[PDB]
């Protein structure tokens, strides 16, 4: 067995397939960075860092020797534990289709929100400078009224033009911002369609971020480095409950500082 | 061309072959750790760290998330610059066999001394805990008189026996210690032969270390991790001088704390 | 699964291979009886006794009936439990090479010491008369000074000669005795080499015994009877710790009383 001690869990083959179905569906729904950034695939469990290629000065070990330390970005393992009732597990082989997997969906949404808030807003303890702090383009303010929002998106696309970046321009919208531009209409159309008629890329529902992000998907600018992808592992169980977790080992690197514009809420 | 800009050097093909011959011969003469430790081969120029497999605690990015940072040992690049007269370079194609390569030999000896002092005595700025500080066995004192030296080697082999480590036992001797046991005789034999009749391994001339080291060569205890091996690169040149360097990118990891005994001078 | 409930342990395939590697290496280092005695191989888990071939008198079940009870030596199961941290188990699949297996090494050393103290010093509760009490040759005293030790080994070999036993003579040395004859020298050689030049067999490091043993390895004199060999089994686990054990089911029989000389410390 591997570090996910899944053979030790009192979960059947069918109940495992239903848990991982709810996990993959909820994670894919709530993730937004993986649709725009480059994803360096799962390198394995023995991957601990990403080489940045840079040299760091260190004090020399002796005289006449020049010493440089190789810079690397360490990967962070993000674990979201969740609790699953054993009665819902046992009901699956009896043919139930309404087994309670809301804690699986809450943990998949939490792991998706943590990964996207690390890519876009930064995780400083894991040395992840997000897209917002790496952005050399000036930050726009999202207006309060939704009609003025496609204006400020057009100002965000003028800054990508002034920076010299081509590629399909995609827009990442926060949840409270996406609701604002979907529930408000103009000329028989929601405001979100007005932003669709400004960019050649996709309008992304990004429920973890704050504000908005306009960025380029030409490639080579933003790198999500996965050591291991999203896995479900087992912790412990009593008679009523199996304790599980959602894991992910990742780091995020921004290479191009001018390929994005961040917008404040 | 690569980062060793050797095509830009005013050094001929024959003079390059004579420089690298003096570099490899002097480095192999003065290195001692590579004869006892395990050498993980040159992984390439893009290798910046070695995964230790451990997890480090970090502050969580949010609530209900457990975050762990992957531990890694960064590699250190050690560069020893050296100066070669251009007249010695030009003499090689004229058929000279006494071209002055003493600065090549001084730089190869300096890079060998830095690597061995990192493996055995530690390089703290590059987070290299050496064999001496990693050793859980108690440190012996080397006596002043050379006749009492094979006694204290036998006490160092009693501690490897008490630790439960098998394998051929090799002895690493410092330069001022190796001279002491070679220039002194007993019963028609040098003291170094008395230490040969105590261990099943090799007596190693280790001119960079202090004191002595008795350790096991069973394997899996000491790991020298090379990113790139010993290379000669070019820096600059005037009319009289080519400026070169000896490079090495390495780190050293000690896995087994009880597989060695350090002896103080 | 078998009585070693190893599928129930939260130990990965790689961490199991590292535990059993440390167990076999430490056990082979610290065992000494198996190198000199005859080892009747693992007969299986259903083996409970060894037939001695003798008859015991019992009271008859009736008149005109002679009853004899078949003598047998019962096998003893020796279990050494040990505790392994789960963080060291999880680090193995992340590629760690310094996982803490000192409790595996302490339990392997304890099981090796118990088996050798049963073979040589006897385990009376399991009806194992050891080699020392089975020896019909008179017991020598090991001297305090190490120079007089190869003299008393030569007196121990005169008693094997007086008993009529041939075969390679091997010497088993206690740990505090082996240290005494290795750390002391004579004529440019340790005292242990002086004992090598007295016997045609091997000098055995026997860290479990007291004193010394000189015996014959002609075969057919000393029988270690294994029901099952050294196995690692699983007991229980919490979140931090897996509880394991080292097991062995054995008995030891001495057939020839005159094929050994015991020496007191």
From TrEMBL, chains A, B, C:
Keyword Protease included in the entry's annotation: no
Pfam families named in the record: Linocin_M18
Record's subcellular location: Cell membrane; Encapsulin nanocompartment
InterPro entries attached to this UniProt entry: ENCAP (IPR007544), Encapsulin_nc (IPR051429)
NCBIfam families xrefs: encap_f1 (NF041155)
PANTHER family named among the record's database cross-references: PEPTIDASE U56 FAMILY, TYPE 1 ENCAPSULIN SHELL PROTEIN
Name of the molecule in the record: Type 1 encapsulin shell protein
């Amino acid at each position: 067995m591997n570090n996910l001690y899944r053979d030790l869990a009192p979960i059947t083959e069918s109940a495992w397939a239903e848990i991982e179905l709810e996990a993959t569906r909820t994670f894919k729904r709530h993730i937004a960075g993986r649709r725009v950034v480059d994803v360096s695939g799962p390198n394995g469990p023995t991957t601990a860092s990403v080489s940045t290629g840079h040299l760091l000065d260190v004090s020399p070990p002796g005289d006449g020797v020049i010493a440089h330390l190789r810079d690397a970005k360490p990967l962070v393992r993000l674990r979201v534990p969740f609790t699953v009732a054993r009665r819902d597990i046992d009901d699956v082989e009896r043919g139930s289709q309404d087994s309670d997997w809301d804690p699986v969906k809450d943990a998949a949404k939490k792991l998706a929100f943590v990964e996207d808030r690390a890519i876009f807003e930064g995780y400083a303890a894991a040395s992840i400078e997000g897209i917002r702090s790496s952005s050399s383009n000036p930050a726009l303010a999202l207006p309060d009224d939704a009609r003025e929002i496609p204006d400020v998106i057009a100002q965000a696309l003028s800054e990508l033009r002034l920076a010299g970046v081509d590629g399909p321009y995609s827009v990442l919208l926060s949840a409270e911002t996406y609701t604002k531009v979907s529930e408000t209409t103009a000329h028989g159309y929601p405001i979100r369609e007005h932003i669709n008629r400004l960019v050649d890329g996709e309008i992304i529902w990004a429920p973890a971020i704050d504000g908005a992000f306009v960025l380029s998907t030409r490639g080579g600018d933003f790198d999500l480095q996965l050591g291991t992808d999203v896995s479900i592992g087992y912790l412990s169980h009593d008679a009523e409950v199996v304790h599980l977790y959602m894991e992910e080992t990742m780091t995020f690197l921004c290479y191009t500082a001018e390929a994005s514009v961040a917008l404040t809420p």
